[PDB]
Amino acid sequence: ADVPANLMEQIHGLETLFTVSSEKMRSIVKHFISELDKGLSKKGGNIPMIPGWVVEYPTGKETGDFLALDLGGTNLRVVLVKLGGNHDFDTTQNKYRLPDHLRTGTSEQLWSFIAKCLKEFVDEWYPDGVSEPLPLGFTFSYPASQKKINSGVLQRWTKGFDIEGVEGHDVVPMLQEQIEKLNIPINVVALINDTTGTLVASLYTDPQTKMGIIIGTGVNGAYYDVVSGIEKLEGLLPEDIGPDSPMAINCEYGSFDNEHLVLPRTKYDVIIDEESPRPGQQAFEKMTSGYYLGEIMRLVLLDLYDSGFIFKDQDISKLKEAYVMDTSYPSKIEDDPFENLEDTDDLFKTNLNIETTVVERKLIRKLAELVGTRAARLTVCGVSAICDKRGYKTAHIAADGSVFNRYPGYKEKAAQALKDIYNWDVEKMEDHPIQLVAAEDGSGVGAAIIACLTQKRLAAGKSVGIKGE
Template sequence: MSAWLSRKVSAFTIHDVDGSEAQKEAVNYIAKEFEVSTENLRTIVKQFNEDIDKGLQRHGATVAMIPSFVQGRPTGQEKGKYLALDLGGTNLRVCEVNLLGDSKVTIHQQKFVVSNELKTGEMRHLCDYIADCVDSFLTENGSDKLDSDLQLGFTFSFPVNQTAINRGTLMQWTKGFDCHGAIGKDVVIMLQDSFRRKNLNVNIAAIVNDTVGTLMANGYRDPKSHMGVILGTGTNAAYYEKMEKILKWDHGEINVPEMAVNMEWGAFDNERRVIHLTPYDNKLDRESINPRFQIYEKLISGMYLGEIARNVLLHLIDRTLLFNGLSSIDLNKQWSFETAYMSTIEADATQDLSDTQHVLESILAIPTTTLIDRQIVKKVCEFVGVRAARLSAAGLGAVLSHCNKVEEGCTIAIDGSVFEFYPNFADNMMAGLKELFGDQIENKVKFSLARDGSGLGAAVIAMMAHNAPKI
């Protein structure tokens, strides 16, 4: 096994892999395939920084670097009652956020299910449904009798060409949504029209990307927050950029020193220049709904990690090096090996790896597994998970170096199931940063879990947008 992987992986591995020479050789080969050396990390950071600069200079760059139109930072002293709306998956979340000052806040929220019919029907019907949900929420909370408009921040987690703090045209649908009559249209105007038809005293003050929301939410509690990162089903990041560096800004002069920028970093290295893609990654990419796009996201986020591991396991099965060459109907299905299973397997500290056995035999219906089989599966999960954390560290390192935050330090607000639940993910990210910048970085940079930060963040941005001079 390579020196890097023996150093990085064995630190949190309970069992070494025994087995035949062929099995050991295969595991060593896979370890090498997923290795990201310190030299690789530095190369990736260098390319990331070049792509950041390109995205700030011109429209249409691979790493898009989209200005958020959010001016200034929250101080934590803001007060007031604001609404937040979060749409981006199966659930619609409506929040009433009461900012109390002194970085204190109370949040009341309610979730509503978005049916498949609404996801693929007319956009007007989806907007009317959202308005009905907001109406129901306000009525239940007694906020429907207010004379003045409630200001709302709308977290809309789809690609949007934003032209103002409260204006943005939908570029394309993702995540299973495909509503008719929406692409190329201003989603704020469409939803505001539905609010008016329902006679709701609600004004959409801002449309918000979830990374920017995460940054602002954490900023209300911690003024040292400089980045907002999503490491969950998908991945993205936002950070504060100096206006003088946003060379492509073409919306007139503004008198603010900085603005939050939505990086859309999941597209990094679509050109395949610096990240080594394994055959297992290439198979996943070919079979995805967007081949050759979102390459970085496909290597580090929860939607994809389990599928990469599944591809490795099937390769070993085909070589009769795992499960005696026997698979199952369940394991043969695309996406069947969930990233949550990887978390369970990586965390399995039982002597006989019984938790791993449960996943393989009871859930995935593998006929039978040996201890050696389970040890190999655990190693495969570790290789995929460690690589994801180290590649994530490269993205963080690029922003830290770009913003000269290595010496000064900052807080990085992170939301998402991979960061929160995947074993050792945060530790392995920090290990990557130490290799890049030295051990002192651990005392300079802090990771802060910002669970469901987009709700609070959207409300904070609605407050800031309502009170700020218009761009």
């Protein structure tokens, strides 16, 4: 199969629509820097820039036993972390099904069950008893605000959870109360977002870590800023958190560029946005999340069908369905090792009921590569904005999420993206001054380490939040 001229011209067209140059990346990074700055100076810039209330770097010399509680859709995960003091740690964990009848929810049965689980865990791993109370970090992945690290006021339940009387209430004393009633030796000392945990856990084992990044269905970034650079906290901070203090920031930068000033959206991206549940929101996420990569390809193929280029005489009644193509499509297609692209052929015939020619499959494959590479290039603009804003010339960027972990070539695409931005003369990725590395476990390990850092301050009578809180 040699690609017909009319189809080659379309592929060149797709390349012009979807490729992101070095220079464009650099202009996007520049806008991203002042949007991060703006989020730090004011409540409600499009980038939240949420203080995470971690005000020290882990040194890697911390030792001792620390717990984490990771509360999930159908599971509660309880993690014990043993910190070895040399950037090292051992871990063990249990998961507990949350019972059917109490997601539907009394606040007090929810916490009694979480407590009963922690009791079971503590009795199994400390059968002789614990000398001292174990500090616990709580990854609580539901909309919440906190004015100190040892607090989480739930804005709203999510994910089938409908428990009355939790919303508008701090969950920490609710949970702490049931722990005390069971006479379990645990204190709940921190509530975090998982990405904040991804940064701190990775930094403990890897001191070059300068950022924790999630690239999945959702996108998030966390890094350490400095207090003198967080204008929106001026007048709010107690005496022992001064201008020199570090501050962990949970970015929530998915809303970056909602104004649509800098992202190179194509007509296909504009459709995804208009058709989404929230047009004009989540702009950066829409352009980088693995969730939309298949819908992008679908709209493109449908457009080429509609203009006469491809799928002639085919049944497009499945192709016409929004979100029929999930992230597994560009993923499988990029992974297709066959010269004649047989995995691509199977996917389209079987799932979409479309028979393809080899030349169509070559176009489809080129398109998957374009969409995936674009996603990665835009993601690293977030990475480069944090680094450039903070004057980090070298960095380990601790990454997680189903896209970073599972999408074909993702790490090679990101690394080439950084290398083009900074224009390095370095042959191999492993040697890039700024590189993406596999994160440590954020929601588990990360929470327990944060619980460690927080305890250092509390034990000292030192503040971990806004004055008078």
